[PDB]
């Protein structure tokens, strides 16, 4: 203990036929105060992995440094650091999962909920979750915080089980992710309009999109809504 | 401390083909101490049967209350109360004590004398009606009863087959509960005959 302070909200993600997509907004909240508006919560590791982090931002920055140090360390005395002995999404996740569970076991957790998204050496999609308790799980769609309640239902309508993954294109997957981010902006009071989105594809590699915005919003219907029951004017 | 598990006990009710069954254990205890092995939890008012689990003082009080009310009902209406009507009376009566409730889990069972339709219903301590087609469970081994009934039950069982199903549901549920057992009773109810059977079970 004691408490998360400056925090990031939902991280959402899903698998598709040739890879994975992950997204997270650019807000750092300070309670109900929307304090920091340019926080990047997707952190790429190499060209095959993107780690999405929610929760305490100070701990996120600590994890960000651990990953940076992991890349440095892997390159030491390693002629194949950019080839066969490069960091895999599975290596990066297992390392973080170890750290998270160790920290909770000392009663001094990193406060975060983490999603590691990537593509393995053999082209396999990697998508797994880990949090402050060291709890880990995998699913065709994964989301943290509010995303778990609102994004997953929408993303699961696209990929409801393992056999739906090969039938899902990157265009359909990205469309679903972007819509979910809009829904979260409507309904999560600790969300922002600005977000980042990353695609890790086994053919086209890592595509990192910054400064995206929620668009095509429906608000017009608000003009007709008056009072809270009996009021007509 | 928890009023609904001081005395212990269970009730289960099931529907069959042109019949209903309601059953209960016979234990009354003071927490770990067994006090009585003859504490029956099923009562009847005419052809309508009521099982009540929970705090034993309230079980007794509610039985006396519903005897009181169904007796006045009969004098005024000039007919015996039906299971559907009685269910509403139980619900009403429990909800009138919304902020000082009886700590009970009542179960109604019976056959409508005019339509011949089998009827069962359950309640929480505050009057919320559970009107299941298949079965109703109540008491300190309700989880165990849900497990037994869900696997053992099938619809349209004949009276003598329903007896075996409900008996085995009760017995094996009660044997996995410290505060239930010490004997058991099963009522098999048909439109104009009711049979009551006391079961043999382990006495620990």
């Amino acid at each position: 203990t004691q408490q998360p302070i400056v925090t990031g909200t939902s991280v959402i993600s899903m698998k598709y036929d040739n890879g994975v997509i992950i997204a997270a907004d650019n807000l750092g909240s300070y309670g109900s105060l929307l304090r920091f508006n340019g926080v990047e919560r997707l952190i790429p590791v190499g060209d095959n992995t993107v780690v999405g982090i929610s929760g305490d931002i100070s701990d996120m920055q600590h994890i960000e440094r651990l990953l940076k140090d992991l890349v440095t360390e892997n390159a030491y005395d390693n002629p194949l650091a950019d080839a066969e002995e490069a960091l895999e999404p599975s290596y990066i996740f297992e390392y973080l999962a170890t750290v998270m569970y160790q920290r909770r076991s000392k009663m001094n957790p990193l406060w975060n909920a983490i999603i590691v998204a990537g593509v393995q050496s053999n082209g396999d999609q990697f998508l797994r979750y880990v949090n402050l308790l060291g709890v880990t799980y995998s699913s065709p769609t994964l989301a943290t915080g509010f995303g778990a309640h609102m994004a997953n239902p929408l993303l699961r309508k696209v990929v409801d089980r393992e056999s739906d993954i090969p039938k899902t294109t990157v265009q359909v997957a990205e469309e679903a992710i972007v819509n979910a981010m809009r829904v979260l902006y409507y309904r999560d009071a600790r969300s922002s309009r600005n977000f980042s989105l990353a695609i890790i594809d086994k053919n086209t590699g890592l595509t990192f999109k910054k400064n995206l915005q929620v668009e095509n919003m429906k608000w017009d219907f608000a003009k007709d809504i008056k009072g809270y029951g009996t009021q007509k004017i | 401390s928890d009023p609904s598990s001081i005395n212990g006990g269970i009730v289960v009710a099931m529907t069959g083909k042109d019949c209903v069954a309601i059953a209960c254990d016979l234990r009354l205890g003071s927490q770990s101490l067994g006090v009585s092995n003859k504490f029956e939890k099923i009562f009847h008012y005419g052809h309508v049967f009521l099982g009540i689990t929970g705090l034993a003082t309230d079980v007794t009080t509610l039985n006396e209350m519903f005897r009181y009310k169904t007796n006045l009902y009969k004098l005024k209406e000039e007919r015996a109360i039906e299971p559907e009507t009685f269910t509403q009376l139980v619900s009403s009566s429990l909800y009138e004590r919304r902020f000082g409730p009886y700590f009970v889990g009542p179960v109604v069972a019976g056959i409508n004398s005019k339509s011949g339709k089998p009827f069962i219903a359950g309640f929480d301590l505050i009057g919320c009606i559970d009107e299941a087609k298949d079965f109703i469970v109540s008491g300190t081994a309700s989880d165990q009863l849900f497990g037994m009934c869900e696997s053992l039950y099938e619809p349209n069982l004949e009276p003598e087959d329903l007896f075996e199903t409900i008996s085995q549901a009760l017995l094996n549920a009660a044997d996995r509960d410290a505060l239930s057992g010490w004997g058991a009773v099963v009522y098999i109810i048909k439109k104009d005959e009711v049979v009551k059977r006391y079961l043999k079970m382990r006495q620990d």
Partner: protein, 212 residues
């Protein structure tokens, strides 16, 4: 839980029930509450199941080391004190243990030590521990004699657990009987309480309150 042990002319009788509960939920009816420390020593399980199992198996290891080093059977006094000194080190940490360490040696004769997780170590003739201990004490106290036969002593231990199994909601399942002699303990079977209750009711005429 109901566990008892008593000294008599023919050694020690150890009798236990078999029920383990988690709240009102009966977790098991087949729990082994007598721990066979070694062929000569027995311990009873009450309080924490793990604490009793673990530390009384550990005790068996310490007893084995003792007799390897000293070339002599460990006394019940020494064996019980190894356990009580151990749990006393852990006092305050939250160990839960109420056990009877039972043995029969040359120098001591039949000996029982009540050992307990707050550090208590009591030598005695009759001990009864568990949620149903008061019921078993009643049958024990009114029927106990030093000059009981092995057969009658075994039945008394069996009947006393049955008394507890009947009345105590958290005792039952089956009865396990042991007879501890100088040459080692002898197991006297598992007895289902359900079957035993009716058998005893008929043969003894007891439990007239219950319809059979």
């Amino acid at each position: 839980t109901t566990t008892l042990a008593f000294r008599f002319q023919g050694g020690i009788i150890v009798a236990v029930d078999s029920r383990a509960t988690a709240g009102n939920w009966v977790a098991s009816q087949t729990v082994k509450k007598v721990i066979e420390i070694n062929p000569f020593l027995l311990g009873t399980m009450a309080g924490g199941a793990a604490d009793c199992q673990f530390w009384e198996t550990w005790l068996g290891s310490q007893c084995r080391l003792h007799e390897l080093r000293e070339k002599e059977r460990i006394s019940v006094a020494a064996a019980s004190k190894i356990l009580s000194n151990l749990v006393y080190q852990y006092k305050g940490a939250g160990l839960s243990m109420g056990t009877m360490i039972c043995g029969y040696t040359r120098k001591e004769g039949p000996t029982i030590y009540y050992v307990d997780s707050d550090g208590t170590r009591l030598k005695g003739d009759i001990f009864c521990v568990g949620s149903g201990q008061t019921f078993a004490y009643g049958v024990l106290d009114s029927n106990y004699k030093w000059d009981l036969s092995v057969e009658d002593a075994l039945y008394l231990g069996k009947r006393s657990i049955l008394a507890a199994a009947h009345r105590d909601a958290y005792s039952g399942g089956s009865v396990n009987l042991y007879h501890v002699t100088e040459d080692g303990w002898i197991y006297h079977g598992n007895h289902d309480v359900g079957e035993l209750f009716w058998k005893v009711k008929e043969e003894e005429g007891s439990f007239n309150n219950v319809i059979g």
